[PDB]
């Protein structure tokens, strides 16, 4: 299983 998180961690996820 791979890591996931809240969108603010990556620029593509939150921005």
């Amino acid at each position, epitope marked *: 299983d791979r890591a*996931a998180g809240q969108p603010a*961690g990556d620029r593509a996820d939150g921005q």
Partner: antibody, heavy 119, light 113 residues
Framework: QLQQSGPELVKPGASVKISCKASGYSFTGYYMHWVKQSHVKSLEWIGRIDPYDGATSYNQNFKDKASLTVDKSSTTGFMELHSLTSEDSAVYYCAREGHWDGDWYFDVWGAGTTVTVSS | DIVMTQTPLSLSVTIGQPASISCKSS???????????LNWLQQRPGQAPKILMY???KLDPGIPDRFSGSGSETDFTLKISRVEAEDLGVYYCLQGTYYPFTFGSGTKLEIKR
């Protein structure tokens, strides 16, 4: 669950590398974030790292200042701070973004590493 | 970056009395996937921050039930029904909607005895 390295005294313009030893969980399954505590009540998010492939995501403020690496064999995460100034004297934390009921949040924190930049 | 404004910044509460902390964000924390990534954290003296609640109103299972969370898109509120002596510390709000993560200024909760 997370054990951080001891305090550091760093000369200005030098570099420091602090560690965050993980244990008791699948190391490659969770992001490892780093937080800076400059003043008494100031918290800044530095960045995160995927310990499986080393993929890193940085805060724009700490780009060219922080470098995140992991050692999968020792299940330890590292943050290197470059060209330290007095502004870098702070307490740095590592945290795990854990999983509970399909949701993700900072469920484990290290005790913090005190970094003092001085001549 | 999202600006997180906490009111008040200091708070004095007697043991057994309610306490309320507000957090206002510069933009709506409702993500496109429908989740509102607002987190409340507590930092006791000499300790690392600890998550009290995530997703506005969901408590971490270890946290006692006297803590509760509410609030919409931009305005949020952390409530303690009955303040106890162990609740002393600094309280933060944390948004996880927009990159990058941004914390609030922090609210210092002091006990009156």
């Amino acid at each position: 669950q997370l054990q951080q390295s001891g305090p550091e005294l760093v000369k200005p313009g030098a570099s420091v590398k602090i560690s965050c030893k993980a244990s008791g969980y699948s190391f490659t399954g969770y992001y490892m974030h780093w937080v800076k505590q400059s003043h008494v009540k100031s918290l800044e998010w530095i960045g995160r790292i995927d310990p499986y492939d080393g993929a890193t995501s940085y805060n724009q403020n700490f780009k060219d200042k922080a470098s995140l690496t992991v050692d999968k064999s020792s299940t330890t995460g590292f943050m290197e701070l470059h060209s330290l100034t007095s502004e870098d004297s702070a307490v740095y934390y590592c945290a795990r973004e854990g999983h509970w009921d399909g949701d993700w949040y900072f469920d484990v924190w290290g005790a913090g590493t005190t970094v003092t930049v001085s001549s | 970056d999202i600006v997180m404004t906490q009111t008040p910044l200091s708070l004095s509460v007697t043991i057994g009395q309610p306490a309320s902390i507000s957090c206002k964000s510069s933009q709506s924390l409702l993500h496109s996937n429908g989740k509102t990534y607002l987190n409340w954290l507590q930092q006791r003296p000499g300790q690392a921050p600890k998550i009290l609640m995530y997703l506005v109103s969901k408590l971490d299972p270890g946290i006692p039930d006297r803590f509760s969370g509410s609030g919409s898109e931009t305005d949020f509120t952390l409530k303690i029904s009955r303040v106890e002596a162990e609740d002393l510390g600094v309280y933060y709000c944390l948004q996880g909607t927009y990159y990058p993560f941004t914390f609030g200024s922090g609210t210092k909760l002091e006990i009156k005895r």
